[PDB]
Design an enzyme around this catalytic site. Structure first.
Site, PDB file in Angstrom:
ATOM      1  N   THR A   1       8.581 -10.669  14.581  1.00 35.75           N
ATOM      2  CA  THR A   1       8.966  -9.531  15.429  1.00 35.75           C
ATOM      3  C   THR A   1       8.115  -9.435  16.687  1.00 35.75           C
ATOM      4  O   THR A   1       6.932  -9.763  16.672  1.00 35.75           O
ATOM      5  CB  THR A   1       8.951  -8.189  14.701  1.00 35.75           C
ATOM      6  OG1 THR A   1       7.625  -7.804  14.353  1.00 35.75           O
ATOM      7  CG2 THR A   1       9.795  -8.236  13.397  1.00 35.75           C
TER       8      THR A   1
ATOM      9  N   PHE B   1      -9.494   1.897   7.704  1.00 43.22           N
ATOM     10  CA  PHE B   1      -8.769   2.065   6.412  1.00 43.22           C
ATOM     11  C   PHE B   1      -9.737   2.326   5.266  1.00 43.22           C
ATOM     12  O   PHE B   1     -10.671   1.543   5.028  1.00 43.22           O
ATOM     13  CB  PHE B   1      -7.930   0.831   6.170  1.00 43.22           C
ATOM     14  CG  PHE B   1      -6.789   1.032   5.178  1.00 43.22           C
ATOM     15  CD1 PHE B   1      -5.596   1.633   5.592  1.00 43.22           C
ATOM     16  CD2 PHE B   1      -6.918   0.608   3.855  1.00 43.22           C
ATOM     17  CE1 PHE B   1      -4.520   1.806   4.654  1.00 43.22           C
ATOM     18  CE2 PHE B   1      -5.858   0.765   2.912  1.00 43.22           C
ATOM     19  CZ  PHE B   1      -4.672   1.353   3.312  1.00 43.22           C
TER      20      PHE B   1
ATOM     21  N   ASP C   1       7.717  -1.967   9.408  1.00 43.89           N
ATOM     22  CA  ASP C   1       8.116  -1.618   7.998  1.00 43.89           C
ATOM     23  C   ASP C   1       9.574  -1.140   7.879  1.00 43.89           C
ATOM     24  O   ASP C   1      10.263  -1.513   6.895  1.00 43.89           O
ATOM     25  CB  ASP C   1       7.154  -0.577   7.428  1.00 43.89           C
ATOM     26  CG  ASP C   1       5.754  -1.133   7.227  1.00 43.89           C
ATOM     27  OD1 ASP C   1       5.612  -2.363   7.075  1.00 43.89           O
ATOM     28  OD2 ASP C   1       4.793  -0.326   7.208  1.00 43.89           O
TER      29      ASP C   1
ATOM     30  N   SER D   1       0.818  -1.203   0.000  1.00 46.40           N
ATOM     31  CA  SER D   1       0.000   0.000   0.000  1.00 46.40           C
ATOM     32  C   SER D   1       0.863   1.269   0.000  1.00 46.40           C
ATOM     33  O   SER D   1       2.023   1.299   0.487  1.00 46.40           O
ATOM     34  CB  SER D   1      -0.947   0.029   1.212  1.00 46.40           C
ATOM     35  OG  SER D   1      -0.220  -0.043   2.408  1.00 46.40           O
TER      36      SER D   1
ATOM     37  N   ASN E   1       6.560   2.972   3.382  1.00 51.99           N
ATOM     38  CA  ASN E   1       7.407   2.919   4.590  1.00 51.99           C
ATOM     39  C   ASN E   1       8.601   2.000   4.376  1.00 51.99           C
ATOM     40  O   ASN E   1       9.710   2.342   4.810  1.00 51.99           O
ATOM     41  CB  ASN E   1       6.582   2.353   5.794  1.00 51.99           C
ATOM     42  CG  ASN E   1       5.340   3.213   6.127  1.00 51.99           C
ATOM     43  OD1 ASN E   1       5.251   4.393   5.767  1.00 51.99           O
ATOM     44  ND2 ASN E   1       4.371   2.590   6.852  1.00 51.99           N
TER      45      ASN E   1
ATOM     46  N   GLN F   1      -1.594  -6.352   7.870  1.00 49.53           N
ATOM     47  CA  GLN F   1      -3.016  -5.927   8.021  1.00 49.53           C
ATOM     48  C   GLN F   1      -3.953  -6.534   6.985  1.00 49.53           C
ATOM     49  O   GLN F   1      -5.196  -6.536   7.188  1.00 49.53           O
ATOM     50  CB  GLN F   1      -3.140  -4.396   8.008  1.00 49.53           C
ATOM     51  CG  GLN F   1      -2.387  -3.706   9.062  1.00 49.53           C
ATOM     52  CD  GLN F   1      -0.991  -3.258   8.623  1.00 49.53           C
ATOM     53  OE1 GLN F   1      -0.282  -3.950   7.860  1.00 49.53           O
ATOM     54  NE2 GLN F   1      -0.564  -2.146   9.164  1.00 49.53           N
TER      55      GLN F   1
ATOM     56  N   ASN G   1       4.664  -9.852  12.658  1.00 55.94           N
ATOM     57  CA  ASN G   1       4.840  -9.687  14.114  1.00 55.94           C
ATOM     58  C   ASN G   1       4.224 -10.888  14.866  1.00 55.94           C
ATOM     59  O   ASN G   1       3.614 -11.759  14.231  1.00 55.94           O
ATOM     60  CB  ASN G   1       4.335  -8.307  14.622  1.00 55.94           C
ATOM     61  CG  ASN G   1       2.805  -8.167  14.666  1.00 55.94           C
ATOM     62  OD1 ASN G   1       2.049  -9.147  14.694  1.00 55.94           O
ATOM     63  ND2 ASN G   1       2.350  -6.907  14.717  1.00 55.94           N
TER      64      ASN G   1
HETATM   65  N1  LIG Z   1       9.631  -0.120  22.137  1.00 51.00           N
HETATM   66  C1  LIG Z   1      10.617  -0.450  21.255  1.00 51.00           C
HETATM   67  N2  LIG Z   1      11.931  -0.222  21.517  1.00 51.00           N
HETATM   68  C2  LIG Z   1      12.901  -0.559  20.622  1.00 51.00           C
HETATM   69  N3  LIG Z   1      12.666  -1.145  19.441  1.00 51.00           N
HETATM   70  C3  LIG Z   1      11.388  -1.408  19.064  1.00 51.00           C
HETATM   71  C4  LIG Z   1      10.262  -1.085  19.949  1.00 51.00           C
HETATM   72  N4  LIG Z   1       9.100  -1.502  19.311  1.00 51.00           N
HETATM   73  C5  LIG Z   1       9.478  -1.998  18.092  1.00 51.00           C
HETATM   74  N5  LIG Z   1      10.851  -1.958  17.976  1.00 51.00           N
HETATM   75  C6  LIG Z   1      11.706  -2.490  16.894  1.00 51.00           C
HETATM   76  O1  LIG Z   1      10.902  -2.672  15.733  1.00 51.00           O
HETATM   77  C7  LIG Z   1      10.703  -4.048  15.401  1.00 51.00           C
HETATM   78  C8  LIG Z   1       9.287  -4.222  14.826  1.00 51.00           C
HETATM   79  O2  LIG Z   1       8.332  -3.747  15.769  1.00 51.00           O
HETATM   80  P1  LIG Z   1       6.961  -4.597  15.896  1.00 51.00           P
HETATM   81  O3  LIG Z   1       6.152  -3.779  16.887  1.00 51.00           O
HETATM   82  O4  LIG Z   1       7.225  -6.039  16.320  1.00 51.00           O
HETATM   83  O5  LIG Z   1       6.424  -4.581  14.405  1.00 51.00           O
HETATM   84  P2  LIG Z   1       5.005  -4.165  13.729  1.00 51.00           P
HETATM   85  O6  LIG Z   1       5.107  -2.700  13.408  1.00 51.00           O
HETATM   86  O7  LIG Z   1       4.960  -5.030  12.546  1.00 51.00           O
HETATM   87  O8  LIG Z   1       3.896  -4.535  14.709  1.00 51.00           O
HETATM   88  C9  LIG Z   1      10.963  -4.777  16.691  1.00 51.00           C
HETATM   89  O9  LIG Z   1      11.292  -6.152  16.459  1.00 51.00           O
HETATM   90  C10 LIG Z   1      12.064  -3.924  17.306  1.00 51.00           C
HETATM   91  O10 LIG Z   1      13.291  -4.384  16.680  1.00 51.00           O
HETATM   92  O1  LIG Z   2      -5.544  -2.809   5.836  1.00 52.35           O
HETATM   93  C1  LIG Z   2      -4.439  -2.176   5.363  1.00 52.35           C
HETATM   94  N1  LIG Z   2      -3.954  -2.511   4.140  1.00 52.35           N
HETATM   95  C2  LIG Z   2      -2.801  -1.968   3.628  1.00 52.35           C
HETATM   96  N2  LIG Z   2      -2.109  -1.078   4.353  1.00 52.35           N
HETATM   97  C3  LIG Z   2      -2.494  -0.684   5.610  1.00 52.35           C
HETATM   98  C4  LIG Z   2      -3.690  -1.282   6.245  1.00 52.35           C
HETATM   99  N3  LIG Z   2      -3.851  -0.751   7.471  1.00 52.35           N
HETATM  100  C5  LIG Z   2      -2.816   0.131   7.682  1.00 52.35           C
HETATM  101  N4  LIG Z   2      -2.025   0.129   6.561  1.00 52.35           N
HETATM  102  C6  LIG Z   2      -0.758   0.861   6.452  1.00 52.35           C
HETATM  103  O2  LIG Z   2       0.102   0.140   7.402  1.00 52.35           O
HETATM  104  C7  LIG Z   2       1.186   1.027   7.658  1.00 52.35           C
HETATM  105  C8  LIG Z   2       1.930   0.598   8.933  1.00 52.35           C
HETATM  106  O3  LIG Z   2       2.566  -0.677   8.671  1.00 52.35           O
HETATM  107  C9  LIG Z   2       0.543   2.405   7.761  1.00 52.35           C
HETATM  108  O4  LIG Z   2       1.408   3.411   7.141  1.00 52.35           O
HETATM  109  C10 LIG Z   2      -0.766   2.257   6.994  1.00 52.35           C
HETATM  110  O5  LIG Z   2      -0.830   3.108   5.844  1.00 52.35           O
END
Ligand SMILES: Nc1ncnc2c1ncn2[C@@H]1O[C@H](COP(=O)(O)OP(=O)(O)O)[C@@H](O)[C@H]1O
Ligand SMILES: O=c1[nH]cnc2c1ncn2[C@@H]1O[C@H](CO)[C@@H](O)[C@H]1O
Ligand SMILES: Nc1ncnc2c1ncn2[C@@H]1O[C@H](COP(=O)(O)OP(=O)(O)O)[C@@H](O)[C@H]1O
Ligand SMILES: O=c1[nH]cnc2c1ncn2[C@@H]1O[C@H](CO)[C@@H](O)[C@H]1O
Ligand code: NA
Ligand code: NA
Lengths: 319, 319
Positions: free
Chosen positions: A219, A116, A252, A7, A51, A168, A191
């Protein structure tokens, strides 16, 4: 170059300065009621492809975004892509349509609940990944469903290895379609919540999923990440964030680091750690693409955290 | 007349067509990631005082809203108040300020997570409840903190009985301030989640809270409500909704019905049931004030649900 399918979107992010976990009362008919004060809304540049390409570009990689935008309001993003040196070759701008918009409500644990409005993302399958030239690696991220499935099939047919990142988009998949995507994928990056959903929908265990990819990367926010591959599982530490402002798009930024590492033949420990650092750099700023380290700053922070500089293998083995 | 103290606000509501409960995985570092498709955003007339007065006005009551709006964008609401016959006597419009705005993300269980940009609500204490003329009953709803506390003290000093409805304002209160508000209140109306938070912050049990009010009313969504009073506890049934579209402001429609019942000497069983019906009428439409039954339609639906017509006691007892 690396094709980044997903996206492209404008984000409106509302960050709760707290943890939804502390406010959920499962025993009640209403399990959460929470109102929190926010400042004026500001639109940010987002979308998963935006991103991930942004992160890959920060590191010096060659990110080629493949996504659709809506002609009606694409211009600021097109101008931003030009200013950052991101190729627009595979950014299709659709006439008389609006670009994807996300209203993201999140907490400091990165629990995102997003309303969204997909707009032009609905027509993401107008792009054909199989037609993209000079691609050595790709990612298929959250996108229109038809576009996600088509990108996996086209890349597999073209023999372009790819990271599958359903994110998502996961609810759009059924078991058969998810199993098929994993079969086609070379790596999967999710994640920990998405990982449980993947296991649930496919009916496969993590062992079974790992048997079908070169790496299963999961993650875990502030807990870092795990990378399961043929010879073992890396425990990837988090990098301590300078401050925790907004976790939106941490995953991302992490995927941008992983793609860079894979392209340059990093070992998994170092690819993971670079990815982990990108996520920590990103969380110290509001919005998914506001952080802007130079490559020298990235390398210095990597060496501070981990004790060595990040780069690809210099082993000239037979392969 | 009935003084309705609380927020006046413009709402932007994103409704998940589902239940967040089914998507929370407490064992994971990320306990919820959910993206759901929404149509174009539309601003709605809201705010707790706006919604409660709207409901009271539907029933034929005399609702006098006491709240602050911002001069910069108050006009559509001021014009709406005029068109509905709602007095603007205590609607203060503050110069060079914007009106409160809520971005509400919710599910069909009415789990609201709201990003609130308070604007003029911050100055709600510029209104003095003690000065309002011809008030026989009041409600103190979610508002600026200083304004909430001042309204409870002024109404108590003026001897105007009031419903205390802390709602989304609950986090602004500490134990001493919450205990004091309850002491001053004649009735308290909360949903079941807010009730648990009230018990937690005051450190009082429901028994202890009920000992300090004429009625403790606790709403339970599709499960109806309970009204605890001196002589017993009413179990108030829900009315089956014609369709479930948007629960935002169900509690406020319910409070409009309760205020009407109290003013007109309804027994608690019938005041509760009218309140319960208002909430069911409201949920069948998007936005807190979109439903627009006539009083004859309300009475017909009441009689269908419950077997009698709603009105105040005709007993001429000594009191
Ligand atoms: N509070 C934090 N402090 C430091 N690093 C972070 C934190 N949250 C996320 N990160 C870094 O970003 C990565 C991805 O974050 P995560 O929250 O697991 O992904 P998503 O955005 O897909 O949910 C983590 O594995 C870590 O390396
Ligand atoms: O349902 C969805 N489909 C595609 N992209 C999305 C959805 N929801 C959020 N984001 C996008 O996910 C990013 C964070 O990883 C955000 O920048 C948002 O634009
Ligand atoms: N799904 C539903 N069906 C019918 N009536 C409902 C439903 N949800 C709410 N109501 C009516 O509205 C009242 C208040 O709703 P509730 O969700 O408890 O309040 P709040 O908006 O304060 O969280 C309920 O007690 C019920 O009478
Ligand atoms: O924190 C707050 N303070 C005051 N009012 C609020 C808050 N959050 C939401 N609303 C208002 O609550 C109504 C539904 O009952 C919504 O109309 C919204 O405007
Ligand atoms: Na595979
Ligand atoms: Na009291």
């Amino acid at each position: 170059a690396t094709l980044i399918c997903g996206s492209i979107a404008y984000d409106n992010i509302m960050t709760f300065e707290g943890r939804f976990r502390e406010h959920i009362l499962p025993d009640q008919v209403h399990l959460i009621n929470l109102s929190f004060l926010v400042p004026t809304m500001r639109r940010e540049f987002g979308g998963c492809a935006g991103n991930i390409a942004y992160a890959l570009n920060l590191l010096g990689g060659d990110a080629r975004m493949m996504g659709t935008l809506g002609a009606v309001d694409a211009q600021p993003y097109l101008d931003r892509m030009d200013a950052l040196g991101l190729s627009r070759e595979y950014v299709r701008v659709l006439p008389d349509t609006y670009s994807a918009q996300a209203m993201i409500t999140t907490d400091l644990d990165n629990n995102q609940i997003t309303a969204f409005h997909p707009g032009a993302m609905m027509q993401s399958h107008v792009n054909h990944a199989g037609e993209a030239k000079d691609i050595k690696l790709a990612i298929v991220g959250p996108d229109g469903f038809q576009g996600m499935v088509q990108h996996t099939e086209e890349l597999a047919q073209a023999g372009v290895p790819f990271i599958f990142d359903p994110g998502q988009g996961l609810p759009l998949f059924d078991g058969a379609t998810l199993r098929r995507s994993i079969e086609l994928a070379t790596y999967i990056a999710v994640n920990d919540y998405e990982a449980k959903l993947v296991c649930d929908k496919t009916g496969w265990s993590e062992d079974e999923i790992a048997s079908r990819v070169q790496a299963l990367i999961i993650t875990r926010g502030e807990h870092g990440a795990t990378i399961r591959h043929r010879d073992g599982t890396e425990q990837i530490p988090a990098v301590r964030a300078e401050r925790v402002i907004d976790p939106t798009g941490c995953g991302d930024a992490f995927r941008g680091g992983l793609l860079y590492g894979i392209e340059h033949g990093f070992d998994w420990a170092t690819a993971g750690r670079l990815a982990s650092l990108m996520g920590a750099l990103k969380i110290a700023h509001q919005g998914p693409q506001t952080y802007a380290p130079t490559r020298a700053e990235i390398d210095a922070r990597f060496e501070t955290a981990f004790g060595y500089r990040p780069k690809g293998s210099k082993l000239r083995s037979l392969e």
